[PDB]
Structure 1
Amino acid sequence: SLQPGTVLILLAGRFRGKRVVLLKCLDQGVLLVTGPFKINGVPLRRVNARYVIATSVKVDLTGVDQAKIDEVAQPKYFTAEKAKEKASEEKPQKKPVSSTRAADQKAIDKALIANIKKVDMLASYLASSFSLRKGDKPHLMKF
């Protein structure tokens, strides 16, 4: 159900309800996803397949740099400056985004965002949170 370039619905974590786009499927059940940030605020981040839900909206990935994605897919990209950043955090101010990280998003979200602005109302879909109304049945409704 999940392929490179598929819209996912996060069910847990800080970004709960936030519909995102899965770009690359990693190993041991982890997934590399992104908003894109300019749409719903979700950055280039890795989540769990058991906590995502796969919709059938599939977005085109033509023109997207696979090499750049495969660099973020490495096993120390996110958990690297983690020790230094948290320690440095110790009036409150927003911790700064690794120059490298703010620099990477822009590339991938520029290409992906362009292919999303093409499909009718898709920006609106991705920017909105999924929520459960009254009378809707998760075992019957098709995603």
Structure 2
Amino acid sequence: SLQPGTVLILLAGRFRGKRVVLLKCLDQGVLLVTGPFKINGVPLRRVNARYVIATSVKVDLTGVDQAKIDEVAQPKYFTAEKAKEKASEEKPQKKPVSSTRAADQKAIDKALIANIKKVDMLASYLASSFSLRKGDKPHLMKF
């Protein structure tokens, strides 16, 4: 149900119940997803397949830097500096985003929004949040 470039609904975590795009499928249940950031506020991040739901909608992925994607997918991109930000942060102030993350997010989401604005109301769909409303039965509904 999950392919490179597919909209998923994150169910748990900080961005719970919210739609992003799966870009690359990592190993051991790890998925590299992005909002894109300028669309719904979710940056480049990795989540879990058992906590996402795969939607049948497929986004046109042509025009994205696959070398940039797998360079980010290398297994240090977060943990290498995580300790540095933890030590720096711990009146309250938002700790700064790394320049590498900013640059890769800008390239990736520029390409992705350029592709997304082609089909109608997909930007609004990706910006909107997911919720279950009375009478909605997950065991029957098609995603």
Give the TM-score range, shorter chain: over 0.9
SS in 2 for 1:21: strand
Deviation at 1:90, TM superposition (A): 2.4
Residues 33-57 of structure 1 deviation map (CA, whole Å, 9 limit, x = unaligned): 0000000000000000000000001
Deviation at 1:116, TM superposition (A): 0.6
Deviation at 1:13, TM superposition (A): 0.2
Q: Runs (4+) of structure 1 moved beyond 6 Å?
A: none
SS in 2 for 1:80: helix
Residues 52-98 of structure 1 deviation map (CA, whole Å, 9 limit, x = unaligned): 00000100111101000001111111111100111110200000001
The residue that corresponds to 1:18 in the other structure is 18
Under a length normalisation based on structure 2, what TM-score does the superposition of the two structures give? 0.99
1:45 and 1:68 map into 2 onto residues whose CA distance is 14
Residues 13-35 of structure 1 deviation map (CA, whole Å, 9 limit, x = unaligned): 00001100000000000000000
2:90 and 2:76 map into 1 onto residues whose CA distance is 23
The residue that corresponds to 2:71 in the other structure is 71
1:79 and 1:90 map into 2 onto residues whose CA distance is 16
Residues 71-129 of structure 1 deviation map (CA, whole Å, 9 limit, x = unaligned): 11111111111001111102000000011111110000000111111110000000000
CA RMSD of aligned residues (A): 0.5
Note the residue ranges of structure 2 that are not aligned, 5 or more in a row. Answer: none
SS in 2 for 1:103: helix
2:129 and 2:74 map into 1 onto residues whose CA distance is 29
Aligned pair count reads: 143
Under a length normalisation based on structure 1, what TM-score does the superposition of the two structures give? 0.99
1:84 and 1:93 map into 2 onto residues whose CA distance is 16
Counting only pairs closer than 5 Å after superposition, residues 113-128 of structure 1 correspond to structure 2 as 113-128=113-128
1:139 and 1:90 map into 2 onto residues whose CA distance is 44
Identity among equivalent pairs (%): 100
SS in 1 for 2:24: strand
